[PDB]
Design an enzyme around this catalytic site. Sequence first.
Site, PDB file in Angstrom:
ATOM      1  N   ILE A 152      -4.679   8.726  -0.494  1.00 66.78           N
ATOM      2  CA  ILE A 152      -3.384   9.407  -0.251  1.00 66.78           C
ATOM      3  C   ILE A 152      -2.986   9.829  -1.832  1.00 66.78           C
ATOM      4  O   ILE A 152      -2.600  10.951  -1.962  1.00 66.78           O
ATOM      5  CB  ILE A 152      -2.242   8.793   0.681  1.00 66.78           C
ATOM      6  CG1 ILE A 152      -2.927   8.448   1.948  1.00 66.78           C
ATOM      7  CG2 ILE A 152      -1.076   9.319   0.520  1.00 66.78           C
ATOM      8  CD1 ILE A 152      -1.912   7.422   2.723  1.00 66.78           C
ATOM      9  N   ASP A 171      -3.409   2.855 -11.488  1.00 63.31           N
ATOM     10  CA  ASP A 171      -3.996   2.226 -10.358  1.00 63.31           C
ATOM     11  C   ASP A 171      -4.711   1.124 -11.050  1.00 63.31           C
ATOM     12  O   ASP A 171      -4.921   0.960 -12.417  1.00 63.31           O
ATOM     13  CB  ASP A 171      -5.235   2.862  -9.882  1.00 63.31           C
ATOM     14  CG  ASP A 171      -5.603   2.370  -8.330  1.00 63.31           C
ATOM     15  OD1 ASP A 171      -5.974   1.276  -8.460  1.00 63.31           O
ATOM     16  OD2 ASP A 171      -5.401   3.044  -7.499  1.00 63.31           O
ATOM     17  N   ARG A 232       4.066   0.896   1.604  1.00 72.03           N
ATOM     18  CA  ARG A 232       4.439  -0.122   1.993  1.00 72.03           C
ATOM     19  C   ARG A 232       5.973  -0.506   1.417  1.00 72.03           C
ATOM     20  O   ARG A 232       6.091  -0.598   0.043  1.00 72.03           O
ATOM     21  CB  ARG A 232       3.578  -1.441   1.782  1.00 72.03           C
ATOM     22  CG  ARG A 232       2.487  -1.504   2.790  1.00 72.03           C
ATOM     23  CD  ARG A 232       1.981  -2.878   2.718  1.00 72.03           C
ATOM     24  NE  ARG A 232       0.903  -2.969   3.655  1.00 72.03           N
ATOM     25  CZ  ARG A 232       0.271  -4.123   4.025  1.00 72.03           C
ATOM     26  NH1 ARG A 232       0.809  -5.551   3.759  1.00 72.03           N
ATOM     27  NH2 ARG A 232      -0.784  -4.272   4.998  1.00 72.03           N
ATOM     28  N   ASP A 256       9.169   6.365   4.383  1.00 73.37           N
ATOM     29  CA  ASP A 256       8.794   6.537   5.488  1.00 73.37           C
ATOM     30  C   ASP A 256       8.640   4.946   5.921  1.00 73.37           C
ATOM     31  O   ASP A 256       8.426   4.724   7.175  1.00 73.37           O
ATOM     32  CB  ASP A 256       7.485   7.091   5.630  1.00 73.37           C
ATOM     33  CG  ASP A 256       7.036   7.290   7.103  1.00 73.37           C
ATOM     34  OD1 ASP A 256       7.628   7.684   7.924  1.00 73.37           O
ATOM     35  OD2 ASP A 256       5.762   6.940   7.428  1.00 73.37           O
ATOM     36  N   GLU A 261      12.348  -2.402  10.119  1.00 73.20           N
ATOM     37  CA  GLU A 261      12.534  -1.177  10.735  1.00 73.20           C
ATOM     38  C   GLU A 261      13.028  -1.524  12.276  1.00 73.20           C
ATOM     39  O   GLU A 261      12.097  -1.726  13.219  1.00 73.20           O
ATOM     40  CB  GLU A 261      11.317  -0.422  10.493  1.00 73.20           C
ATOM     41  CG  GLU A 261      10.936  -0.408   9.429  1.00 73.20           C
ATOM     42  CD  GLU A 261       9.282   0.394   9.375  1.00 73.20           C
ATOM     43  OE1 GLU A 261       8.782   0.627  10.411  1.00 73.20           O
ATOM     44  OE2 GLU A 261       9.074   0.834   8.265  1.00 73.20           O
ATOM     45  N   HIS A 282       8.770   5.991   9.836  1.00 78.33           N
ATOM     46  CA  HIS A 282       7.403   5.153   9.648  1.00 78.33           C
ATOM     47  C   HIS A 282       6.609   6.222  10.747  1.00 78.33           C
ATOM     48  O   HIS A 282       5.686   5.823  11.463  1.00 78.33           O
ATOM     49  CB  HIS A 282       7.274   3.863  10.566  1.00 78.33           C
ATOM     50  CG  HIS A 282       6.038   3.244   9.718  1.00 78.33           C
ATOM     51  ND1 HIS A 282       6.362   1.903   9.131  1.00 78.33           N
ATOM     52  CD2 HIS A 282       5.082   3.454   9.399  1.00 78.33           C
ATOM     53  CE1 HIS A 282       5.100   1.459   8.745  1.00 78.33           C
ATOM     54  NE2 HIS A 282       4.338   2.394   8.762  1.00 78.33           N
ATOM     55  N   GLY A 284       4.457   8.434   9.275  1.00 76.18           N
ATOM     56  CA  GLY A 284       3.327   8.939   8.353  1.00 76.18           C
ATOM     57  C   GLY A 284       1.932   9.391   8.831  1.00 76.18           C
ATOM     58  O   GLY A 284       1.305  10.321   8.557  1.00 76.18           O
ATOM     59  N   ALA A 285       1.679   8.544   9.942  1.00 78.30           N
ATOM     60  CA  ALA A 285       0.444   8.746  10.870  1.00 78.30           C
ATOM     61  C   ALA A 285       0.636   9.281  12.081  1.00 78.30           C
ATOM     62  O   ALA A 285      -0.261   9.423  12.945  1.00 78.30           O
ATOM     63  CB  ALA A 285      -0.312   7.351  10.827  1.00 78.30           C
TER      64      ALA A 285
HETATM   65  N1  LIG Z   1       3.719   5.637   6.454  1.00 79.11           N
HETATM   66  C1  LIG Z   1       2.637   5.600   6.917  1.00 79.11           C
HETATM   67  O1  LIG Z   1       2.570   5.861   8.229  1.00 79.11           O
HETATM   68  C2  LIG Z   1       1.032   5.341   6.280  1.00 79.11           C
HETATM   69  C3  LIG Z   1       0.077   6.022   6.548  1.00 79.11           C
HETATM   70  C4  LIG Z   1      -1.330   5.715   6.127  1.00 79.11           C
HETATM   71  C5  LIG Z   1      -1.512   4.901   5.020  1.00 79.11           C
HETATM   72  N2  LIG Z   1      -0.182   4.169   4.816  1.00 79.11           N
HETATM   73  C6  LIG Z   1      -0.171   3.160   3.501  1.00 79.11           C
HETATM   74  O2  LIG Z   1      -0.349   4.095   2.299  1.00 79.11           O
HETATM   75  C7  LIG Z   1      -0.918   3.378   1.398  1.00 79.11           C
HETATM   76  C8  LIG Z   1      -2.016   3.993   0.706  1.00 79.11           C
HETATM   77  O3  LIG Z   1      -3.196   4.157   1.641  1.00 79.11           O
HETATM   78  P1  LIG Z   1      -4.694   4.849   1.204  1.00 79.11           P
HETATM   79  O4  LIG Z   1      -5.333   5.200   2.301  1.00 79.11           O
HETATM   80  O5  LIG Z   1      -4.657   5.624   0.140  1.00 79.11           O
HETATM   81  O6  LIG Z   1      -5.256   3.200   0.738  1.00 79.11           O
HETATM   82  P2  LIG Z   1      -6.246   3.276  -0.725  1.00 79.11           P
HETATM   83  O7  LIG Z   1      -7.164   2.030  -0.369  1.00 79.11           O
HETATM   84  O8  LIG Z   1      -7.344   4.401  -0.633  1.00 79.11           O
HETATM   85  O9  LIG Z   1      -5.692   3.315  -1.960  1.00 79.11           O
HETATM   86  C9  LIG Z   1      -4.650   2.430  -2.364  1.00 79.11           C
HETATM   87  C10 LIG Z   1      -4.693   2.415  -3.908  1.00 79.11           C
HETATM   88  O10 LIG Z   1      -3.506   1.609  -4.557  1.00 79.11           O
HETATM   89  C11 LIG Z   1      -4.350   0.652  -5.351  1.00 79.11           C
HETATM   90  N3  LIG Z   1      -3.423  -0.440  -5.761  1.00 79.11           N
HETATM   91  C12 LIG Z   1      -3.305  -1.638  -5.018  1.00 79.11           C
HETATM   92  N4  LIG Z   1      -2.257  -2.595  -5.567  1.00 79.11           N
HETATM   93  C13 LIG Z   1      -1.865  -1.641  -6.796  1.00 79.11           C
HETATM   94  C14 LIG Z   1      -0.880  -1.927  -7.805  1.00 79.11           C
HETATM   95  N5  LIG Z   1      -0.419  -3.248  -7.875  1.00 79.11           N
HETATM   96  N6  LIG Z   1      -0.697  -1.197  -8.877  1.00 79.11           N
HETATM   97  C15 LIG Z   1      -1.483   0.219  -8.916  1.00 79.11           C
HETATM   98  N7  LIG Z   1      -2.217   0.560  -7.739  1.00 79.11           N
HETATM   99  C16 LIG Z   1      -2.579  -0.543  -6.779  1.00 79.11           C
HETATM  100  C17 LIG Z   1      -5.551   0.203  -5.081  1.00 79.11           C
HETATM  101  O11 LIG Z   1      -6.490  -0.483  -6.135  1.00 79.11           O
HETATM  102  C18 LIG Z   1      -6.087   1.655  -4.554  1.00 79.11           C
HETATM  103  O12 LIG Z   1      -6.713   2.342  -5.569  1.00 79.11           O
HETATM  104  C19 LIG Z   1      -1.520   1.855   2.070  1.00 79.11           C
HETATM  105  O13 LIG Z   1      -0.214   0.968   1.678  1.00 79.11           O
HETATM  106  C20 LIG Z   1      -1.210   2.316   3.635  1.00 79.11           C
HETATM  107  O14 LIG Z   1      -1.189   1.089   4.248  1.00 79.11           O
HETATM  108  C21 LIG Z   1       0.942   4.392   5.224  1.00 79.11           C
END
Ligand SMILES: NC(=O)c1ccc[n+]([C@@H]2O[C@H](COP(=O)([O-])OP(=O)(O)OC[C@H]3O[C@@H](n4cnc5c(N)ncnc54)[C@H](O)[C@@H]3O)[C@@H](O)[C@H]2O)c1
Lengths: 312, 312
Positions: A152, A171, A232, A256, A261, A282, A284-285
């Site tokens: 994302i 990251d 999160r 989101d 919640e 929430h 997002g998906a």
């Molecule tokens: N709101 C929603 O409905 C919704 C939908 C899909 C995903 N999400 C959330 O979005 C987030 C990202 O998902 P994604 O698929 O891109 O995941 P991803 O695993 O592809 O990417 C997450 C990135 O953040 C990094 N990271 C972890 N801890 C870190 C820190 N302390 N500092 C900097 N970077 C850090 C990881 O190393 C990784 O590159 C997740 O928390 C996921 O659960 C929310």
Amino acid sequence: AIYTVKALITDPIDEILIKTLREKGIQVDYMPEISKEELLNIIGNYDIIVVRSRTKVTKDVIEKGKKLKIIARAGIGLDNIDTEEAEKRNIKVVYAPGASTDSAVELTIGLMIAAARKMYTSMALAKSGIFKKIEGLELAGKTIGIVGFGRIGTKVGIIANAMGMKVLAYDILDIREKAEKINAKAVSLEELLKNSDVISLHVTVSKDAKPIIDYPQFELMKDNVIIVNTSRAVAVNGKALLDYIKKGKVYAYATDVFWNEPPKEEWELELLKHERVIVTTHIGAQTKEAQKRVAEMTTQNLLNAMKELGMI
Amino acid sequence: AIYTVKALITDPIDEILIKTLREKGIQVDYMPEISKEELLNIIGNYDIIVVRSRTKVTKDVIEKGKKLKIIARAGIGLDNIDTEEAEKRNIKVVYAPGASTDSAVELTIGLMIAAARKMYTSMALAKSGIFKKIEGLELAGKTIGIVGFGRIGTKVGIIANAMGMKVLAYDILDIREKAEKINAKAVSLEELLKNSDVISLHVTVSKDAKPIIDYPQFELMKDNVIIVNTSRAVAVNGKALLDYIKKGKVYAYATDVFWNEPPKEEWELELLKHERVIVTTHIGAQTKEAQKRVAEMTTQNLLNAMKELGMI
Ligand SMILES: NC(=O)c1ccc[n+]([C@@H]2O[C@H](COP(=O)([O-])OP(=O)(O)OC[C@H]3O[C@@H](n4cnc5c(N)ncnc54)[C@H](O)[C@@H]3O)[C@@H](O)[C@H]2O)c1
Ligand SMILES: NC(=O)c1ccc[n+]([C@@H]2O[C@H](COP(=O)([O-])OP(=O)(O)OC[C@H]3O[C@@H](n4cnc5c(N)ncnc54)[C@H](O)[C@@H]3O)[C@@H](O)[C@H]2O)c1
């Protein structure tokens, strides 16, 4: 005799998965509202369990499921599954990782713009028949800091760059080249915080981990910063956030995700009602396309796991 | 004797322009609330008039302004100025064309996403403490049709392309190469309408012109189309729109412009209250940055016109 493999579906799910299993002769027991207690009483009779989110596949559930070989989560995460216990039992765990990426990316951009332009306030006014203009902030030419440059985060960066924003990314993992490829620049969290007009959070963190955006980080931020969060809630110190919003430093927080919640704690409630806080439920998906992919991916990953086990 | 050039400012405007004129010795009479009648009584004494939007520089006003040499509109348009009469009198007319482009582009993208994801509904629910999820539509992979490929239309296309959308564009002017340069494709309005999942309007049209999006165009559209409009309300047949929204064909209409703001006609009111209609209060140019550019550009263009006239 021939093994008759048995699957238990404990939550209301997309019919595509159930239909696919039934078409292949698999014995499918669909109990979308089975109680906690009844689950424990019968889990031992199944080779496969399919859950969404209502049902919790805890350690005791797995122990009772003596025949469990595959655990399927029809979702984008596994927070309701004891993955550690599952691995010990050598139980394959499948779901739909990355299935909602574009939908989450789009909501992120939408939240950023809504926050920058006070769109909610304007839309509420319009619906009430009061067409009073409201002034916000322009985004082009400004700097956006992507914290968490994964599936994302990377796409949000590509879009922000196209919007004429300068993209910085941080990251914990190596992203130097990945950032450069999209015209972004990988930097330290400190540099990102000191130079970003907009900060977008897209990290994967645990529930018991300390927030990545805490007091020191808030202090490093630029004045009038806009913070967007579709990852999160725990990644942010909510109390510190409220503190900095009340101080007038944070222009807006668009999210989101909320710690609770709906909110229950006093400080959470104060944040929710603040004019500088923008919140979606929430979603997002929550798109037809993403939800269909979740079902299809969970179904396909389940089938692959079954094939590897020689079931089909 | 030395000419003492006189300027009349009839509306509340950014102090930058007034300060700039005063610093240069120009006699500036600031009457931000001067009545229609009083204006006609004194306009004949000025070489320059600066207006925003409250004041109407009609034909009779120009005729009375026997000494008028420059008319300055501190805005992005000239709908309150009789440009034809002004040209006949050889009166230079200046303003700030294109001053709000990026702000309008950003609001367009924001409206598109808000409409696709029912963000307003979700945000309203959240603020009420009801965190119920709402499902919308994903944009990636879909086709967007840009009607009016000018300053704003072009940038919306660049951003939509980055969002993974296929971009089609239509303009009455030649845009074949311009479209290709941003990975878009210039097509006929018919092709755009038949193939677009999202249609974004960015045209410049007159008030008495027939709408570009009328009944035939609505019929050509795809089912569940999302229509975004940040250009002009008159570009769309509002009654036809309501008809197609009620039929269930149009998924949503997201706009920053309404035929009447606020609405007065029965059909307009019905549109405004419909759940599939998303409206912002004409805030497309309402950002601190855009408003500052409007003031600076109007001031700079006014100074250039004065220099060409030998005043400074
Ligand atoms: N709101 C929603 O409905 C919704 C939908 C899909 C995903 N999400 C959330 O979005 C987030 C990202 O998902 P994604 O698929 O891109 O995941 P991803 O695993 O592809 O990417 C997450 C990135 O953040 C990094 N990271 C972890 N801890 C870190 C820190 N302390 N500092 C900097 N970077 C850090 C990881 O190393 C990784 O590159 C997740 O928390 C996921 O659960 C929310
Ligand atoms: N909501 C707001 O606050 C806000 C802010 C700025 C501009 N606007 C409006 O947005 C619109 C676009 O502004 P812009 O700066 O990009 O203007 P522009 O002059 O750069 O582009 C307008 C384009 O639409 C084209 N066009 C005219 N009639 C057409 C038709 N019938 N079919 C297809 N194309 C047609 C033109 O040929 C031109 O290429 C205008 O209506 C403008 O007044 C609204």
